[PDB]
């Protein structure tokens, strides 16, 4: 599914990254899918805990603080 | 904080500051 | 333009919907949030892969993923790239 061209653009936001191999965006497309999946499932835990069927930004903020693998997102979605 | 990510988190703070200091990403959105 | 720094909202949303029960809903704001997280995820790994040697290649990204605590992603990703190129 996800658009390779757009993944490349995001990678190319960094001044240092100049040349990217063609495979690299393919890997990211799948990796981003796996990552969205686990983040979303962890967020959903808190959605249910607040007796909602609608996942909200604070659920993601909470799930970020509960998993050391998501430490890099603390600045992005502060609890 | 995750010992694996600590250094790279600091670097990305600085990279985000730079793109901001330009106009390639916003402060908030 | 947002089209220049984020994945398309509907595409991000489709992946999220698959992750929650059919009965579930996702707020616009949460779709937008994941949109932001996924861009950071790409940039985080990329930045590490950039400092793997010295072209950023698939091997660089895989190592960075291992370095930064996403080791669980490596085998699935290698299996994916395999199917992809075959």
Numbering used by the authors:
A (entry chain C): 42 to 120
B (entry chain A): 268 to 296
C (entry chain B): 53 to 106, 112 to 143
Sentences from the paper on this structure:
Even though constrained helical interaction motifs generally show a tendency to inhibit PPIs,1a only very few have been reported to directly target transcription factors with sufficient affinity to enable the inhibition of complex assembly.12a, 14 The nuclear transcription factor Y (NF‐Y)15 is a trimeric complex (NF‐YA/B/C) that binds to a particular DNA sequence (CCAAT box), thereby activating genes involved in regulation of the cell cycle and DNA repair. NF‐Y subunits B and C form a stable heterodimer, which by itself does not possess relevant affinity to DNA target sequences (CCAAT box DNA). Only upon availability and binding of the third subunit (NF‐YA) is the transcriptionally active trimeric complex formed and DNA binding occurs with affinity values in the low nanomolar range. In this study, we aimed to inhibit the interaction between the NF‐YB/C heterodimer (light/dark grey) and NF‐YA (green) to prevent transcription‐factor assembly and DNA (blue) binding.
For PBM, we observe well‐defined electron density for all amino acids except G289 and R295, both located in the C‐terminal part of the peptide. The central part of PBM adopts an α‐helical conformation (Y272–A287), which is flanked by extended peptide stretches. Except for the C‐terminal part (K290–E294), PBM superimposes closely with NF‐YA in the DNA‐bound complex (RMSD for V267–E288: 0.52 Å). To identify the crucial interaction motif within PBM, six truncated sequences (1–6) and PBM were synthesized and fluorescently labeled to determine dissociation constants with the NF‐YB/C dimer using a fluorescence polarization (FP) assay. Initially, we identified a 14‐mer α‐helix with a short extended N‐terminal stretch as the protein fragment crucial for NF‐YB/C binding.
